[PDB]
């Protein structure tokens, strides 16, 4: 392509990095260093305490939650030698999952999703992972992680993660993220089952809004999952020097999982389209019954009103000079034709 | 040699010859007045207000050594922004934009730029532009424009256009914010018409902005010899701003679509409820019209004469059927 440089933005000083987000509540740096023999964990809020970990033999996992603090991000990037555009991408959350391979580090942007039962939003938060010689730098917007299994594996010496380097740590984080995606798909399964139960019982406008927001959420999920598939493909099919020769089959497993997620998302979309069609048919039927009632009454009272007007005539010479029970005869005739046409419409299975 | 546009009100020539030493400006109506400035070493700016005056634009076309095809493109108005490179000069087409919030209207005017050796020509449609900041900068030395060459003037012109796009985006932003409340709360027909108009304006803006991004990209990636390398980064800056505009209009587009969807899919409920209203009105009043017509159905007999004070009694039984309709619909929850 072209040379990479910090793009200028109107209304800002030339070198400003801006956090492109909405979360500004909390911020802390948790450091988890681990080897086979021992491990040390500590939380803090000063970057000068975590900087000494740039040069360390044992693998380490730095996790900075809260990126509204641009100062700590800039300091970490300039100490770790990270390119300023990668820092700009870390603080920009209006992106899609991506992977960039550099000489001394690899930069990965992924997304964490959260589904709320109430009001049925689909909140998203990017996670940025910079993989270095022996350090994994994680940047998050707010608290709430899906990497607690990885933390437990490090803490209690399960698996083989303590015996491997930072590449396996990056694997553990991505695998936990994909498992979170599976859990999100399960939540969407529950939501679509409940909404399908409700759709044919109460065809209301809130059902319309729920279905449309579900479709939009599925579209956004696909827009996220496809670049995730591309990143996982590039990780094991275009291997940088940072990732060792082994651990590639692990990335292959994650790529297979992403394939599964994409297929599930496409099936989800076709199911919800069918559900919307079913709702439209149900509402059309609900209008149809009211239409049947209207046409029943109209066909009852058009000709009878005509003949009432014809016999409400004020002309000089009408049969209003009547033979015995003439008006009862006329009303009996009108009633019998009314019941005959009622019988016909019953033969039509409307009344 | 045809003017495709619809503006023919006025026409005048604005000339600005400026150097590091002195500057001088003309507001005339003679084509020959701009002739001596084709070979002037110092940077020169020509502004031709009226394209419909085909004679003057053609005359400057032959005198400045431009091919007739770009002249026809200049005369044409309703064409997307584009760039074209020659070994003598460079030709650019860009779009003005004005937005009336009171009428929710969007208007575009085409401007054509021709950067030749140490001089710039510009062609507009109406009077009024967004290059007044550039004129002030040239006049009172508010920048570095008088210390630089003619290719910096093209930068200034395009930058001013991009700033006008930013102002138009601010206006569209406030209109979108109003219309979102107009849709989510109390939807109404005029709000739907406003949404359609905004969709048209946004699609036109996108179809205009993307070619402008391509034009500035082609300008700064493979720079022609007309534009100096020193001024290449400045163009890059302007190019970046275009991306900015791109994203926001895209976002705006999405929002509008969503709004429309929320109104569009909830249309079967409207017909359902209005059919309910008409059906209940008929259900209640057609039988009562029958009762009135048949009890008023003229005869000599009229067996209901006197008949225990007559009409109020039938009113009662009439009222009877009336209520037995409404409660039934209360059973049906219609109304």
């Amino acid at each position: 392509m072209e040379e990479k440089r910090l793009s200028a933005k109107k209304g800002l000083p030339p070198g400003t990095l801006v956090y492109t987000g909405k979360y500004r509540e909390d911020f802390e740096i948790e450091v988890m260093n681990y080897s086979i023999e021992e491990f040390r964990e500590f939380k803090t809020t000063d970057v000068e305490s975590v900087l000494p970990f740039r040069d360390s033999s044992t693998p380490t996992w730095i996790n900075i939650t809260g990126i509204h603090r641009t100062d700590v991000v800039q300091r970490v990037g300039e100490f770790f030698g990270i390119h300023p555009l990668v820092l700009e991408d870390i603080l920009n959350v209006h992106q899609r999952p991506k992977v960039e391979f550099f000489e001394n580090y690899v930069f990965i942007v992924l997304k964490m999703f959260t589904y709320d039962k109430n009001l049925h939003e689909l909140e998203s938060e990017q996670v940025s992972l910079i993989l270095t010689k022996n350090c994994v730098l994680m940047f998050q917007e707010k608290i709430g992680d899906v990497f607690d299994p990885v933390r437990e594996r490090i803490r209690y010496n399960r698996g083989i993660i303590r015996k491997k380097r930072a590449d396996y740590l990056l694997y553990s984080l991505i695998d936990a993220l994909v498992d979170d995606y599976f859990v999100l798909l399960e939540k969407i399964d529950d939501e679509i089952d409940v909404l399908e139960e409700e759709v044919l019982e109460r065809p209301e406008k809130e059902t319309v809004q729920r279905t449309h927001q579900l479709k939009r959420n599925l579209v956004e999920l696909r827009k996220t999952i496809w670049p995730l598939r591309e990143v996982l493909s590039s990780l094991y099919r275009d291997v940088p020097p940072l990732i060792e020769k082994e651990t590639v089959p692990y990335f292959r497993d994650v790529y297979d999982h992403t394939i599964q997620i994409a297929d599930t998302v496409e099936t989800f979309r076709d199911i919800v389209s069918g559900l919307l069609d079913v709702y439209l048919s149900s509402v059309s039927n609900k209008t149809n019954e009211v239409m049947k009632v209207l046409t029943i009454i109209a066909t009852i009272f058009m000709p009878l009103t005509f003949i009432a007007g014809i016999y409400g005539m004020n002309f000089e010479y009408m049969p209003e000079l009547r033979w015995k029970w003439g008006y009862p005869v006329v009303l009996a005739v009108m009633g019998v034709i009314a019941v005959i046409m009622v019988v016909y419409f019953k033969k039509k299975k409307w009344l | 040699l045809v003017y495709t546009g619809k503006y023919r009100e006025d026409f005048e020539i604005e000339v600005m010859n400026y150097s590091i030493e002195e500057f001088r400006e003309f507001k005339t109506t003679d084509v020959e007045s701009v002739l001596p400035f084709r070979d002037s070493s110092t940077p020169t700016w020509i502004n031709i207000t009226g394209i419909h005056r085909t004679d003057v634009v053609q005359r400057v076309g032959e005198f400045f050594g431009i091919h007739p095809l770009v002249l026809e493109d200049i005369l044409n108005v309703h064409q997307r922004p584009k760039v074209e490179f020659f070994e003598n000069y460079v030709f650019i087409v860009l779009k003005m934009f004005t937005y009336d919030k009171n009428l929710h209207e969007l208007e575009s005017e085409q401007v054509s730029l021709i950067l030749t050796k140490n001089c710039v020509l510009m062609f507009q449609e109406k009077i009024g532009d967004v290059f007044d900041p550039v004129r002030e900068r040239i006049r009172y030395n508010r920048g570095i424009i008088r210390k630089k060459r003619a290719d910096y003037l093209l930068y200034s012109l395009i930058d001013a256009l991009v700033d006008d796009y930013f102002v138009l985006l601010e206006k569209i932003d406030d209109e979108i914010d109003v219309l979102e409340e107009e849709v989510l709360e109390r939807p109404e027909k005029e709000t739907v018409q406003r949404t359609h108009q905004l969709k048209r304006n946004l699609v036109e803006l996108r179809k205009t902005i993307w070619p402008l991004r391509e034009v500035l990209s082609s300008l700064y990636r493979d720079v022609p010899p007309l534009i100096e390398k020193e001024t290449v980064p400045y163009f890059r800056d302007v190019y970046d701003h275009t991306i900015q505009i791109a994203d926001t209009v895209e976002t705006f587009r999405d929002i509008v679509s969503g709004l429309l969807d929320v109104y569009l899919s909830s249309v079967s409920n409207k017909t359902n409820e209005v059919m309910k209203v008409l059906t209940i009105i008929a259900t209640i009043f057609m039988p009562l019209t029958f009762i009135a017509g048949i009890y008023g159905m003229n005869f000599e007999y009229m067996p209901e004469l006197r008949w225990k004070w007559g009409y109020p009694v039938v009113l009662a039984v009439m009222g009877v059927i009336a209520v037995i309709m409404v409660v039934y619909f209360k059973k049906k929850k219609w109304l």
Partner: antibody, heavy 128, light 107 residues
Framework: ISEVQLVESGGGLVQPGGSLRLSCAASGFNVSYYSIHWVRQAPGKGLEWVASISSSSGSTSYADSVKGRFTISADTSKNTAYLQMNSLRAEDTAVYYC???????????????????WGQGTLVTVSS | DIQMTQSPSSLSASVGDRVTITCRASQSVSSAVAWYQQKPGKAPKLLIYSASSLYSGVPSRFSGSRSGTDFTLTISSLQPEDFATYYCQQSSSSLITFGQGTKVEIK
């Protein structure tokens, strides 16, 4: 370490037409990473922004009422922001505050800044 | 300069009442509006930014809304520590401006 705090000094009585420099020292952040603003509140009147600085780029901005005489500078070595006021008249008697702002995101083309922390405010009087 | 006109200027209410203050900009600003409060003799405290977003640490009672060029701050459940002077600010341009304040006093 510690907490964000801006302490400003240098304000005092000055004769009309004179000049003086007001300094603002930070503690809790590097001055270059964020933008530093000066806000002037006349005695018994509302706030009136005067100047801004981004030390990392020197993109100084001045209000129209004080442009041409006030200058704003920032040095990272001392972590200080200075406002030098020359040609000071009797309308410039007020209390001055040294605020720190952060940029936030609204739209792609739209950016806005909001001031997290404020100083104490130094009283600058210009009379007799 | 983009002028912000804030109304009213001498609002008064008791504890538990609802307070609304609206400032309008002479020129369109793309939701880059902040609301501050100032107690007598102290520095202003940031309350609202982005015209809707709530600053961290302030009580949840304060709220902000935008309608076109109008921006309204609302105090729902007023408390005896909300009696200060509230100011608008627009950061749409480099030349940022302020409103002339709105004192909320006792009744």
């Amino acid at each position: 370490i510690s907490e964000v705090q801006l302490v400003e000094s240098g304000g005092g009585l000055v004769q009309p037409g004179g000049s003086l420099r007001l300094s603002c020292a930070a503690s809790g952040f590097n001055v270059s990473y964020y933008s530093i603003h000066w806000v002037r509140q006349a005695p018994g009147k509302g706030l009136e922004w005067v100047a801004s600085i981004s030390s990392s780029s020197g993109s100084t901005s001045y209000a129209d009422s004080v442009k041409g005489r006030f200058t704003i500078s920032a040095d990272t070595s001392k972590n200080t922001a200075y406002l030098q006021m020359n040609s000071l008249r009797a309308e410039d008697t007020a209390v001055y505050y040294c605020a720190r702002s952060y940029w936030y995101y609204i739209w792609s083309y739209s950016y806005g800044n909001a001031m997290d922390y404020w100083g104490q405010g130094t009283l600058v009087t210009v009379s007799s | 300069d983009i002028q912000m006109t804030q109304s009213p200027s001498s609002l008064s209410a008791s504890v538990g009442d609802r307070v609304t203050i609206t400032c309008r900009a002479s020129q369109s600003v793309s939701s880059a509006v902040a609301w501050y409060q100032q107690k007598p003799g102290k520095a202003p405290k940031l309350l609202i930014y982005s015209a809707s977003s709530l600053y961290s640490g302030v009580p949840s009672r304060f709220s902000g809304s935008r309608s076109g060029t109008d921006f309204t701050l609302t105090i729902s459940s007023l408390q005896p520590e909300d009696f200060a002077t509230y100011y608008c600010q627009q950061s749409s341009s480099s030349l940022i401006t302020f409103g002339q304040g709105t004192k909320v006093e006792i009744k």
